[PDB]
Short mmCIF file of C-alpha atoms in Angstrom, two decimals:
data_model
loop_
_atom_site.label_atom_id
_atom_site.label_comp_id
_atom_site.label_asym_id
_atom_site.label_seq_id
_atom_site.Cartn_x
_atom_site.Cartn_y
_atom_site.Cartn_z
CA UNK A 1 9.98 11.57 -22.22
CA UNK A 2 6.62 10.08 -23.39
CA UNK A 3 5.63 6.41 -22.92
CA UNK A 4 7.35 3.35 -24.37
CA UNK A 5 7.35 -0.46 -24.60
CA UNK A 6 9.85 -2.45 -22.56
CA UNK A 7 13.40 -2.79 -23.97
CA UNK B 1 -11.42 -27.10 -29.36
CA UNK B 2 -9.97 -23.75 -28.19
CA UNK B 3 -6.75 -23.93 -26.17
CA UNK B 4 -7.10 -20.87 -23.91
CA UNK B 5 -3.24 -20.76 -23.70
CA UNK B 6 -3.23 -17.39 -22.09
CA UNK B 7 -5.93 -18.16 -19.61
CA UNK B 8 -3.92 -21.20 -18.49
CA UNK B 9 -0.83 -19.05 -17.97
CA UNK B 10 -2.79 -16.57 -15.86
CA UNK B 11 -4.35 -19.38 -13.80
CA UNK B 12 -0.95 -20.66 -12.87
CA UNK B 13 0.06 -17.21 -11.76
CA UNK B 14 -3.14 -16.65 -9.81
CA UNK B 15 -2.75 -20.05 -8.12
CA UNK B 16 0.86 -19.39 -7.03
CA UNK B 17 -0.21 -16.06 -5.51
CA UNK B 18 -3.00 -17.72 -3.53
CA UNK B 19 -0.44 -20.12 -2.13
CA UNK B 20 1.89 -17.25 -1.21
CA UNK B 21 -0.93 -15.30 0.40
CA UNK B 22 -1.82 -18.47 2.41
CA UNK B 23 1.79 -18.74 3.56
CA UNK B 24 1.85 -15.01 4.51
CA UNK B 25 -1.27 -15.39 6.63
CA UNK B 26 0.21 -18.25 8.58
CA UNK B 27 3.75 -16.86 8.88
CA UNK B 28 3.19 -13.47 10.35
CA UNK B 29 5.47 -11.89 13.00
CA UNK B 30 3.36 -12.94 16.01
CA UNK B 31 3.97 -16.44 14.89
CA UNK B 32 2.88 -20.06 14.91
CA UNK B 33 5.02 -23.08 13.74
CA UNK B 34 7.65 -22.87 10.92
CA UNK B 35 6.85 -26.52 9.98
CA UNK B 36 5.71 -25.02 6.63
CA UNK B 37 8.55 -23.24 4.70
CA UNK B 38 7.73 -20.80 1.85
CA UNK B 39 6.62 -21.42 -1.68
CA UNK B 40 9.61 -20.93 -3.99
CA UNK B 41 8.92 -19.60 -7.50
CA UNK B 42 11.38 -22.08 -9.11
CA UNK B 43 9.36 -24.98 -7.63
CA UNK B 44 6.15 -23.90 -9.49
CA UNK B 45 7.65 -22.88 -12.93
CA UNK B 46 6.72 -19.24 -12.43
CA UNK B 47 9.50 -17.65 -14.58
CA UNK B 48 8.43 -19.66 -17.66
CA UNK B 49 4.83 -18.56 -17.32
CA UNK B 50 5.49 -14.90 -16.60
CA UNK B 51 8.19 -14.97 -19.29
CA UNK B 52 5.73 -16.18 -21.92
CA UNK B 53 3.19 -13.56 -20.80
CA UNK B 54 5.89 -10.87 -20.96
CA UNK B 55 6.77 -11.98 -24.50
CA UNK B 56 3.19 -11.97 -25.70
CA UNK B 57 2.62 -8.52 -24.14
CA UNK B 58 4.73 -6.75 -26.78
CA UNK B 59 2.03 -7.52 -29.36
CA UNK B 60 -1.08 -5.38 -29.11
CA UNK B 61 -3.60 -8.08 -30.01
CA UNK B 62 -2.37 -10.21 -27.17
CA UNK B 63 -2.54 -7.27 -24.82
CA UNK B 64 -6.20 -6.85 -25.68
CA UNK B 65 -6.80 -10.51 -24.90
CA UNK B 66 -4.93 -10.27 -21.56
CA UNK B 67 -6.94 -7.22 -20.65
CA UNK B 68 -10.15 -9.22 -21.01
CA UNK B 69 -8.62 -11.91 -18.75
CA UNK B 70 -7.37 -9.41 -16.09
CA UNK B 71 -3.69 -9.98 -16.82
CA UNK B 72 -2.50 -6.72 -15.37
CA UNK B 73 -3.88 -7.45 -11.84
CA UNK B 74 -2.48 -10.95 -11.93
CA UNK B 75 1.04 -9.95 -12.93
CA UNK B 76 1.08 -6.97 -10.57
CA UNK B 77 -0.06 -9.26 -7.70
CA UNK B 78 2.73 -11.69 -8.53
CA UNK B 79 5.36 -8.96 -8.49
CA UNK B 80 4.07 -7.53 -5.25
CA UNK B 81 4.04 -10.82 -3.44
CA UNK B 82 7.55 -11.90 -4.49
CA UNK B 83 8.83 -8.53 -3.20
CA UNK B 84 6.90 -8.69 0.07
CA UNK B 85 8.18 -12.28 0.67
CA UNK B 86 11.84 -12.14 -0.30
CA UNK B 87 12.62 -8.44 0.14
CA UNK B 88 15.61 -6.91 -1.65
CA UNK B 89 16.94 -10.29 -2.62
CA UNK B 90 19.73 -11.11 -5.02
CA UNK B 91 18.40 -14.57 -6.02
CA UNK B 92 18.54 -14.88 -9.81
CA UNK B 93 15.11 -16.50 -10.05
CA UNK B 94 13.39 -13.72 -8.03
CA UNK B 95 15.20 -11.01 -10.01
CA UNK B 96 14.35 -12.58 -13.36
CA UNK B 97 10.71 -13.13 -12.30
CA UNK B 98 10.54 -9.52 -11.15
CA UNK B 99 12.02 -8.23 -14.40
CA UNK B 100 9.65 -10.20 -16.64
CA UNK B 101 6.72 -9.24 -14.49
CA UNK B 102 7.81 -5.58 -14.75
CA UNK B 103 8.31 -5.69 -18.51
CA UNK B 104 4.80 -7.12 -18.90
CA UNK B 105 3.55 -4.26 -16.77
CA UNK B 106 5.48 -1.76 -18.86
CA UNK B 107 3.79 -3.16 -21.98
CA UNK B 108 0.34 -3.36 -20.41
CA UNK B 109 0.44 0.27 -19.21
CA UNK B 110 1.79 1.50 -22.58
CA UNK B 111 -0.90 3.48 -24.38
CA UNK B 112 -3.68 2.22 -22.07
CA UNK B 113 -5.27 4.73 -19.70
CA UNK B 114 -7.44 2.26 -17.81
CA UNK B 115 -4.40 0.13 -16.95
CA UNK B 116 -2.26 3.04 -15.80
CA UNK B 117 -5.11 4.06 -13.48
CA UNK B 118 -5.59 0.49 -12.29
CA UNK B 119 -1.97 -0.27 -11.55
CA UNK B 120 -1.63 3.03 -9.67
CA UNK B 121 -4.70 2.09 -7.60
CA UNK B 122 -2.82 -1.01 -6.39
CA UNK B 123 -0.89 0.70 -3.60
CA UNK B 124 0.92 -2.26 -2.11
CA UNK B 125 2.31 -2.98 -5.56
CA UNK B 126 3.26 0.63 -6.18
CA UNK B 127 5.29 0.54 -2.95
CA UNK B 128 6.93 -2.73 -4.00
CA UNK B 129 7.89 -1.24 -7.39
CA UNK B 130 9.43 1.87 -5.85
CA UNK B 131 11.43 -0.22 -3.38
CA UNK B 132 12.97 -2.19 -6.27
CA UNK B 133 14.93 0.90 -7.40
CA UNK B 134 17.25 -0.04 -4.51
CA UNK B 135 17.88 -3.53 -6.07
CA UNK B 136 21.42 -4.46 -7.10
CA UNK B 137 20.13 -5.46 -10.53
CA UNK B 138 20.33 -2.33 -12.61
CA UNK B 139 18.52 -4.45 -15.22
CA UNK B 140 15.62 -4.63 -12.77
CA UNK B 141 15.89 -0.90 -11.97
CA UNK B 142 15.76 -0.24 -15.68
CA UNK B 143 12.48 -2.17 -15.83
CA UNK B 144 10.95 -0.50 -12.76
CA UNK B 145 11.78 2.95 -14.07
CA UNK B 146 10.15 1.96 -17.39
CA UNK B 147 6.93 1.11 -15.56
CA UNK B 148 7.04 4.37 -13.62
CA UNK B 149 7.70 6.28 -16.82
CA UNK B 150 4.51 4.96 -18.46
CA UNK B 151 2.43 5.49 -15.34
CA UNK B 152 3.57 9.08 -15.13
CA UNK B 153 2.81 9.69 -18.84
CA UNK B 154 -0.66 11.25 -18.97
CA UNK B 155 -1.54 10.22 -15.46
CA UNK B 156 -5.07 11.19 -14.35
CA UNK B 157 -5.56 13.09 -11.07
CA UNK B 158 -5.45 10.01 -8.79
CA UNK B 159 -2.49 8.39 -10.46
CA UNK B 160 -0.47 11.59 -10.08
CA UNK B 161 -1.33 11.84 -6.42
CA UNK B 162 -0.38 8.21 -5.80
CA UNK B 163 2.89 8.50 -7.70
CA UNK B 164 3.85 11.41 -5.40
CA UNK B 165 2.51 9.68 -2.23
CA UNK B 166 4.60 6.50 -2.73
CA UNK B 167 7.84 8.54 -2.89
CA UNK B 168 8.59 7.79 -6.54
CA UNK B 169 10.26 11.08 -7.49
CA UNK B 170 12.74 11.17 -4.60
CA UNK B 171 13.56 7.42 -5.12
CA UNK B 172 14.28 7.71 -8.85
CA UNK B 173 16.45 10.80 -8.34
CA UNK B 174 18.46 8.95 -5.68
CA UNK B 175 18.52 5.93 -8.03
CA UNK B 176 20.02 8.07 -10.86
CA UNK B 177 22.99 9.22 -8.75
CA UNK B 178 24.11 5.60 -8.17
CA UNK B 179 23.41 4.18 -11.68
CA UNK B 180 26.50 2.99 -13.60
CA UNK B 181 24.92 1.76 -16.88
CA UNK B 182 23.52 4.00 -19.61
CA UNK B 183 20.38 1.98 -20.51
CA UNK B 184 19.27 2.03 -16.87
CA UNK B 185 19.89 5.78 -16.54
CA UNK B 186 17.95 6.48 -19.76
CA UNK B 187 14.77 5.02 -18.21
CA UNK B 188 15.30 6.49 -14.75
CA UNK B 189 15.63 9.96 -16.32
CA UNK B 190 12.77 9.42 -18.78
CA UNK B 191 10.53 8.69 -15.78
CA UNK B 192 11.76 11.74 -13.87
CA UNK B 193 11.25 13.90 -16.97
CA UNK B 194 7.57 12.86 -17.11
CA UNK B 195 7.15 13.22 -13.34
CA UNK B 196 8.77 16.65 -13.10
CA UNK B 197 6.00 18.01 -15.35
CA UNK B 198 3.23 17.11 -12.84
CA UNK B 199 3.30 19.60 -10.01
CA UNK B 200 5.45 21.88 -7.90
CA UNK B 201 6.05 19.26 -5.18
CA UNK B 202 7.74 16.93 -7.66
CA UNK B 203 9.99 19.74 -8.92
CA UNK B 204 10.74 20.64 -5.30
CA UNK B 205 11.47 17.02 -4.33
CA UNK B 206 13.97 16.64 -7.21
CA UNK B 207 15.98 19.77 -6.34
CA UNK B 208 15.91 18.78 -2.69
CA UNK B 209 18.15 15.68 -3.16
CA UNK B 210 21.86 15.90 -2.25
CA UNK B 211 23.81 15.99 -5.52
CA UNK B 212 20.73 16.29 -7.66
CA UNK B 213 21.16 19.62 -9.44
CA UNK B 214 24.92 19.01 -9.68
CA UNK B 215 24.25 15.62 -11.37
CA UNK B 216 21.55 17.01 -13.69
CA UNK B 217 23.81 19.80 -14.98
CA UNK B 218 26.49 17.11 -15.47
CA UNK B 219 24.11 15.18 -17.78
CA UNK B 220 24.13 18.16 -20.18
CA UNK B 221 27.75 17.23 -21.07
CA UNK B 222 27.31 13.48 -20.95
CA UNK B 223 29.72 11.49 -23.21
CA UNK B 224 27.82 8.56 -24.75
CA UNK B 225 29.52 5.44 -26.11
CA UNK B 226 26.03 4.59 -27.51
CA UNK B 227 26.38 7.45 -30.03
CA UNK B 228 23.09 8.74 -28.62
CA UNK B 229 21.80 12.07 -27.25
CA UNK B 230 19.03 10.68 -24.99
CA UNK B 231 20.75 11.34 -21.61
CA UNK B 232 21.38 15.01 -22.53
CA UNK B 233 17.81 15.30 -23.88
CA UNK B 234 16.33 13.79 -20.72
CA UNK B 235 18.45 15.40 -18.01
CA UNK B 236 18.07 18.69 -19.89
CA UNK B 237 14.29 18.22 -20.07
CA UNK B 238 14.12 17.51 -16.35
CA UNK B 239 16.16 20.67 -15.72
CA UNK B 240 13.89 22.70 -17.96
CA UNK B 241 10.83 21.60 -15.99
CA UNK B 242 12.35 22.20 -12.56
CA UNK B 243 13.89 25.53 -13.66
CA UNK B 244 10.68 27.40 -12.75
CA UNK B 245 11.48 26.47 -9.12
CA UNK B 246 15.26 27.18 -9.48
CA UNK B 247 14.67 30.66 -10.95
CA UNK B 248 13.32 31.85 -7.57
CA UNK B 249 16.00 30.20 -5.39
CA UNK B 250 19.58 31.51 -5.08
CA UNK B 251 21.15 28.50 -3.32
CA UNK B 252 20.02 26.42 -6.31
CA UNK B 253 20.98 29.01 -8.98
CA UNK B 254 24.39 28.99 -7.32
CA UNK B 255 24.83 25.21 -7.83
CA UNK B 256 24.18 25.67 -11.58
CA UNK B 257 26.73 28.51 -11.84
CA UNK B 258 29.54 26.55 -10.11
CA UNK B 259 29.00 23.75 -12.72
CA UNK B 260 28.97 26.22 -15.72
CA UNK B 261 25.35 25.54 -16.49
CA UNK B 262 24.52 28.73 -18.40
CA UNK B 263 27.68 28.40 -20.50
CA UNK B 264 26.70 24.82 -21.47
CA UNK B 265 23.06 25.81 -22.02
CA UNK B 266 24.13 28.34 -24.69
CA UNK B 267 26.05 25.70 -26.64
CA UNK B 268 22.81 23.67 -26.67
CA UNK B 269 21.18 26.41 -28.80
CA UNK B 270 23.53 25.35 -31.63
CA UNK B 271 22.73 21.66 -31.15
CA UNK B 272 21.42 19.58 -34.01
CA UNK B 273 18.59 17.95 -31.90
CA UNK B 274 15.43 20.09 -31.82
CA UNK B 275 14.74 18.65 -28.34
CA UNK B 276 18.05 19.81 -26.83
CA UNK B 277 17.28 23.33 -28.19
CA UNK B 278 13.66 23.41 -26.91
CA UNK B 279 14.92 22.31 -23.49
CA UNK B 280 17.67 24.93 -23.34
CA UNK B 281 15.24 27.61 -24.59
CA UNK B 282 12.70 26.90 -21.84
CA UNK B 283 15.43 26.62 -19.17
CA UNK B 284 16.83 30.04 -20.08
CA UNK B 285 13.31 31.57 -20.23
CA UNK B 286 13.09 30.93 -16.44
CA UNK B 287 16.76 31.54 -15.50
CA UNK B 288 16.88 34.86 -17.43
CA UNK B 289 13.93 36.19 -15.37
CA UNK B 290 14.41 38.40 -12.29
CA UNK B 291 18.05 37.68 -11.31
CA UNK B 292 20.69 40.33 -11.99
CA UNK B 293 23.93 38.23 -11.82
CA UNK B 294 22.75 35.56 -14.28
CA UNK B 295 21.02 38.18 -16.52
CA UNK B 296 24.39 39.92 -16.98
CA UNK B 297 26.50 36.75 -17.29
CA UNK B 298 24.26 35.88 -20.30
CA UNK B 299 24.89 39.29 -21.98
CA UNK B 300 28.66 38.74 -21.43
CA UNK B 301 28.50 35.32 -23.24
CA UNK B 302 26.62 36.88 -26.15
CA UNK B 303 23.26 35.20 -25.63
CA UNK B 304 21.41 37.93 -27.62
CA UNK B 305 22.91 37.27 -31.05
CA UNK B 306 22.32 33.56 -30.25
CA UNK B 307 18.66 34.00 -29.21
CA UNK B 308 17.99 36.33 -32.16
CA UNK B 309 18.60 33.29 -34.49
CA UNK B 310 15.80 31.27 -32.99
CA UNK B 311 12.89 33.78 -32.58
CA UNK B 312 11.68 33.05 -36.15
CA UNK B 313 11.45 29.27 -35.99
CA UNK B 314 8.39 27.25 -37.02
CA UNK B 315 8.71 25.23 -33.77
CA UNK B 316 6.54 27.05 -31.21
CA UNK B 317 8.47 26.06 -28.09
CA UNK B 318 11.71 27.36 -29.68
CA UNK B 319 10.04 30.58 -30.91
CA UNK B 320 8.36 31.39 -27.54
CA UNK B 321 11.23 30.31 -25.31
CA UNK B 322 13.92 32.24 -27.19
CA UNK B 323 11.72 35.38 -27.55
CA UNK B 324 10.73 35.30 -23.90
CA UNK B 325 14.36 34.74 -22.83
CA UNK B 326 15.45 37.57 -25.13
CA UNK B 327 12.72 39.95 -23.83
CA UNK B 328 14.00 39.41 -20.24
CA UNK B 329 17.56 40.17 -21.36
CA UNK B 330 16.41 43.21 -23.41
CA UNK B 331 14.21 44.86 -20.83
CA UNK B 332 16.94 44.37 -18.09
CA UNK B 333 20.26 45.45 -19.69
CA UNK B 334 23.71 46.06 -18.24
CA UNK B 335 24.51 49.73 -18.95
CA UNK B 336 27.11 48.75 -21.57
CA UNK B 337 24.46 47.13 -23.86
CA UNK B 338 21.73 49.84 -23.43
CA UNK B 339 20.46 51.74 -26.52
CA UNK B 340 21.49 55.13 -25.02
CA UNK B 341 25.09 54.00 -24.61
CA UNK B 342 26.93 52.01 -27.32
CA UNK B 343 24.61 52.53 -30.39
#
């Protein structure tokens, strides 16, 4: 899924 | 002159934790007087402060400034202590505090290797995070998953070990089964997808949960009101990663079959999303190996015409996965589709 910032 | 706005926010947070720590040291189980009740986060304006820090953490410049001030430790300490004090509470203030704290941690671990390592080194916090998957706030679960997701993305050796050791994989998979909201489930699965890539034990621990493989196959035909494919892409990607383990286990293979997995997986080769294809290609690569029943069931649903389409694709994972899956089907034919017969 990779990394992400918070929604 | 200079306001040190951020420093002042972190000092508040550090101070509140010291006070909580002091209360914990006095109020242990073998206990002295309860003439001192707990610090409450509402009484020291903790949401506001963590909220502002959370907000600022979206921006990268601010993150750099926090990182010089040790913002990650401070916020992680705050989260840990509110968990250790109030347990699996439902209080709105504790849940909001925990969310904001978690979002800040999501942002601070995003793209930063040193912070991922550091947060994972904080073991009491890691345990607190994992326990929050059992919260009644799916909004909080969504946050915790998001943290775990980023920690598991390009985790160094230690971080991987820790993530396994704190029971993250088994807790997220159990979390997923109970989740009712799509946004929550997206993050839960995104985390699992990353984690399933790490090692055999994680793959093993996923398959080993009651309802797990059933649920995961079910995600492949998920109906989104969001007009989004991310649940199918994630659940499918998890499945693709664990499929190496499933290949060599008949009890598990059987659970796929009774949910029409291989049928569904072939429809995914059509699909418009290059991800859904890549996932289905790699899943079939492992499920088409060394099992006669499934090998034949794939011939009888015309997999070979379907996989012949994809072998000449520019996308390596589609080219390899379809060729490899094809090669298994070729070199192990039902008599009916042999070259000698039926030319």
